[PDB]
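Page header: ASSEMBLY MODEL / six components / 1734 residues total.
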Amino acid sequence: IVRATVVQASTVFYDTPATLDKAERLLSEAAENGSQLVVFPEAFIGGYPRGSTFELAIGSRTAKGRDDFRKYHASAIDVPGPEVERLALMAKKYKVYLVMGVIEREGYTLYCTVLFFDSQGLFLGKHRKLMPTALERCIWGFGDGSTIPVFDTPIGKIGAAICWENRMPSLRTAMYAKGIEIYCAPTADSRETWLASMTHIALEGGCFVLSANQFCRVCAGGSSIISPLGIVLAGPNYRGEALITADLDLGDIARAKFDFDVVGHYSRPEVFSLNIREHPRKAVSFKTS
Amino acid sequence: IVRATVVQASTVFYDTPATLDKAERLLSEAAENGSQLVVFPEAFIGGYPRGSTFELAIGSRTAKGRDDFRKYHASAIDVPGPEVERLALMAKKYKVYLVMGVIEREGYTLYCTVLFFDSQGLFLGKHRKLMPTALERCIWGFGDGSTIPVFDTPIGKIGAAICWENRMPSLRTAMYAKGIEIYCAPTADSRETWLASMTHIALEGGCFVLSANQFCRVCAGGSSIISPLGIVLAGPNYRGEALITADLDLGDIARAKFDFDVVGHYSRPEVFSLNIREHPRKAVSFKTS
Amino acid sequence: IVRATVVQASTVFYDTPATLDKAERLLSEAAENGSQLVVFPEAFIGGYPRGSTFELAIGSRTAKGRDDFRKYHASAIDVPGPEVERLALMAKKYKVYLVMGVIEREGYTLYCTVLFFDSQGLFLGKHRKLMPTALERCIWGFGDGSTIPVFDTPIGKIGAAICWENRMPSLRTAMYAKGIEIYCAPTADSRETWLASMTHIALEGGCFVLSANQFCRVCAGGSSIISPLGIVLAGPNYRGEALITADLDLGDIARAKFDFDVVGHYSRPEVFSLNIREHPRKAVSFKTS
Amino acid sequence: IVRATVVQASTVFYDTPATLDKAERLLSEAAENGSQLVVFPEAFIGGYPRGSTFELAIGSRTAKGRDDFRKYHASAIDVPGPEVERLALMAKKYKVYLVMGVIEREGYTLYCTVLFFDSQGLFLGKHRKLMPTALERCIWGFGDGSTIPVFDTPIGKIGAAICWENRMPSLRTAMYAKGIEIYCAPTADSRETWLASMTHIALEGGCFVLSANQFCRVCAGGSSIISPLGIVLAGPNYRGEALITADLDLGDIARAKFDFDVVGHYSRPEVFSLNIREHPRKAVSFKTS
Amino acid sequence: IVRATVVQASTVFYDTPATLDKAERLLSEAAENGSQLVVFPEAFIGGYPRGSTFELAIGSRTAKGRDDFRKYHASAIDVPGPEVERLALMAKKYKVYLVMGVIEREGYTLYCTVLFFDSQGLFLGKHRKLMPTALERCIWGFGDGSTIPVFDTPIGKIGAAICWENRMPSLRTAMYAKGIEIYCAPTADSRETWLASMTHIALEGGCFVLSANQFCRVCAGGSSIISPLGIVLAGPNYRGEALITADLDLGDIARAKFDFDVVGHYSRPEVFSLNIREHPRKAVSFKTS
Amino acid sequence: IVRATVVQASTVFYDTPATLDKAERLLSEAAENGSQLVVFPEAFIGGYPRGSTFELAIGSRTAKGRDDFRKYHASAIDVPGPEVERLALMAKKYKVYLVMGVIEREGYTLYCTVLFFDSQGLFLGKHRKLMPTALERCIWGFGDGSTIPVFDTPIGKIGAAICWENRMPSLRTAMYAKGIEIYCAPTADSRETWLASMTHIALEGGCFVLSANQFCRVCAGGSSIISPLGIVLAGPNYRGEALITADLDLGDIARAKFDFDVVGHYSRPEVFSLNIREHPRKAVSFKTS
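Prediction written out in full:
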């Protein structure tokens, strides 16, 4: 039996070493009640530009989109670097597992990735975003196949997905085949749609769906946590920003997969068959001796 | 622009020529307000045995399960036969499209299939059930791959699925690749779970999800109809049995697939790939000359 | 020795059977002076929405973007269909080679492709666009690798590329390895940049670069034709819309590849090496017997 | 923000310790206005024999080509030696970065290389020429793969290329993958061709293209400097020989890679892939103990 | 014991189907005295442009070099094609082994290759030239490593080399390690130098050196044949053009390798060691499925 | 410009302090005409036993081979000792460079080495023979790899080789990689073969080949000197024994390496590669402290 928390705070959107101590004080306030797993929302460190359009008509490209883009580009981080060593030292002080939604750069690009940290201050890996949704295609980049993680821990197996990757059927049945039972999912929207779209994943899976959204000033996001029977433990807190905690019974999965049981004993292999091509493909590959 | 109805009535569960005139009077009452498409619930003609256990412990097989099974077996139909000619003559009198959830027999077996009829009294085809859920495995049979239909009509393309086939990800992304925009789904359960599980399909698709459940005496089923933006047109009528009608705007799909757009321009073919084996496999195959 | 023409006219942007007779009267006026190859601009049949933004902020998705998208979606064509049979019958009447920049649909998507037709009314093939540039990612789709053509004719080998595919180095050195010497390139921009960017391709290649742009009311596009020595035959006509013709000496290529000579005898294979993966990848693949 | 200069002077073509004080007085005159980076043309120290043919018919080899070749061979330098110590002491006196186009010897051969020097009088490295163009194959040699530099400085990353290496697509997309943003390119030709061929590199890249050519008596070379938006800062000075200066805004690159963005987020790795073999290969390799 | 012939005739240098019947009448006149192996000189089919300079100063590139190059380019062949089928049918009529020095094209390039044919009309392979000498670098191309042949026959093992590949030490000790005992060597020069340079190869080897040169009007070439003891069988015929024949004793090799014996029992492997990298490297490599 | 001499005299074959004053009087007669470099033949001091067989059948070993071997063994020298101090004092009297072909002993063995002396009476080094030819294997020994010299002088770089080491290709391309331009080569044979075998080395190299042979009573050896263009300066003097002199133009090498140019810019490093293992290996190695 473990217990996990989600947060709902917002970033200051500029001056990225100043939005890193908010993470420290929230991590300490989430530490003082004996928690074990902390989930941060989407695009927490880099900042999520809401409402801005960058003045892109069809290819007009006015002068006041370029300066806006460089002011947004100068406030991103890069891995591994000085901004992940401090997070490793943050999670190294005591025992907690840490996920974090950051925005990284790689040679004048922007990838909306997510990070993973264990209780011993190691760096497990990262999961980039597969495809940005509608207008984020203009400013962000596409992830490859060699990124989808397993990340087995002594409290279970944890995975992640971002805003509208949870609507694909093929990515979810590729997560289910690796054995996910704690399924984190940050996002950046706030509708009645989202709770009804997460109840289906919590029923189709068997995993404790653990979402997180931010609250700024208005797009009042509501985070929650859902049992694998369809029972909301902690409700959709639209009432300001706060901390949300609940406990997780890991024996409520083998009693929940008695009815449905995806990629085992349903999902007839005699008619359906899937295959995922997972290659680290890169454009230019130097080879020396 | 079309308009479609669902019904919520129950069968008398025995004496199957007597439960066929209820269908006639409901079809006439659904005709008198200018409807165009009528959907009947799961296992309407054959009857759905609720609560019965047939006394199956592990293989004890007491004497009062066999007589119960033969009394249930003697009240099923077979296609094509005298019970589908009357339904073709029923839909042939005026202009309406007809789906129907029956229970067929094929050599001392039971298949929980669904039927399709056009406005001219023809027999389009049928869709058997892929896999029964938990206890229906004891009494019913498994469907093959060569059954999933397209069934293009001059009002659109209509498909179907049964109780817990709507939770598979692979079957839904096999329905989406054929171009479904009117997605009927009968069922035999009544929870808060079911409305939240259909909102996800109506959002992931772009299809007018049109469910149907029965009401008997208690398992008060609630049928509805959901827009492809996540807007319930007619609510979950738990208040007795009645008729439910709404209209369908077919221009609300090309404006709804601007955001998400499954198996087109999402669903990266460079990493994921699916293939469905659709063969008519049978055990014994006689060949003559 | 052949001679080829480019056009500079614009479409009426709506009611796509009405913009198809402008093509007929321009094709006849380009026929009456003994031409042999006619090139039409980018997005001629489907229409190129200039200046419109569809109101996409970050994911706000107001109501007046959806109706704008469906009014744009209802004015596209699909191949093969009734709109390419008329173009085949158009090019079948007399002897001319025909390229054409259309916009096709494939299941509520939009691909900005280009077509090819011979002198006998056959359908050679098509070349979809690899990646749309900045804001066209929101509304259009991505092409695959199994599309890049050779299309050998008895007047030479002709290829094509679209607006900002001509800036990639890898795609141009994949075109050069197949033996292109007549290199059509429609576009949708009008700067001093574009003439200086085509002179480099005409020098790096050895191919008669033959561009085409449209003129509407203002984005006064200028089409031209460039010798493989860097000598502009017909200038950048910014003076309204008109027809532009010149003749092509096919013996001015073997005398032009005496100096530079790309993928032969330059481009050291002992240090550089390229490989193109050209597979027809699709998401769902039905297989029967 | 840095500022850089190019020169346009010519050598005296013989007596190579006498053409080294012209470099001193030009370096001092370029020092007195607060410059930071000085670029010298192609083959400045060794001399570039223009118009001479050496009497090579097909292999006739008359007597008056051998004495001409030895008089040209006796006026070359060798690295490291007494001619680079004086250049290091020249750049060591004050703070300036120095590139220089020399001609080196290595055992009765001639390599047309280029040199690099920092502000502290160190020797960073050198970049030999990959392949000479047409007639220089008779007298010069070929470079290997283990020579292409990165050379990161505290004012950016600087690279180089020579006369007709800038027309290869593979070498430029091998320079782009290492992160070049100041792209020096000496040459030895003077056409209208060259400005139109450098505008394409400045647009395809994002780098401040900084060319240099010489002026002797006539082949009036014209050097320039081009912004990464396609805006010529200092024009093609055909009016005698002079000094040319401009300033460089390093924030005009992250605002310029918002549209195109080569080897990031364009250049689809799922279809194209490149690999460069970078080995120091030599004919005879002695090994001892 | 075999017997072999060399020829000394010249080509008409233009109209390449007319210089192919001279080969027929010489092949018949060499057939009528019971010969078994016929060797033709360097660049026999394509023609060897002697004395022409193409007006290449340093990169001036006057107009009367381009037309000269295209008139030379239009008189070359390509393998496999219609010009090697006739040579296979020529050698297929009776029993003779055939080598032939042609000039091939491969996409506006020129490779000075050599061909091989057996007694049954098959096509064994080809040997391109490794590096052209001084001025032929301007017009011809470089061969790769995956071309050096063995070509075992029932009369021995035959190899080949071209004009100044016979002066390299590494290529000859790569030929010796494969077991060459009949070593053909066409050329295009006529000095006292050449006989003294072939006596050394015939002594260092053990192979019957069998050279061939052409005679036109003056560069009076002289072909010969040398025993592996240093004994000229047929002298350097400077007296016009004619046929030259001699017989070959294959037992004069195992009695000749009693003294010297290269890559066996000399050539100390404890101090010297060689390795040849033999890879088929090409610039662009398409891969499909 | 230097000038060098070779001698052609013979030894008295016994009583080795008596054959050392012949060297003195020949060195003085070669001094009196202003020479600068004197070359002595193979096995001058120790004596070269011609025609003797030592009665070695297969291993019969008669008594009159042992006394013949000890009478030959008692007339050899050892380095460094009393016989090289007198030669150093001989070359120390005036300015001349001295090479000398001696026979040394090392613990009842015989090595056919060659010596080197400068103008100041120093001892530069020695070059033992790699492998004796046919019958000299019975009486002489094998040299190792750590012996091949460079020996740079202020008149150039001088090297050496002995009788049939000049036929190996690997040893000559190991001499060429160190920069030899004066290539001494004593021998002990007299054929027409030898002049034709040295013309190839003088052409393949660029070095003034300077051979020397002895004349006794008949094996009339003929020494010569060959320009690096293939022009014999002083002919093959078969007319008794005498002194042979000529002058050497060191500017006739950089004009001679314009055509061919071995281990530079020919000898493709991308396909061929050589490596020489140069270790001082000895059987028993005492180590103390």
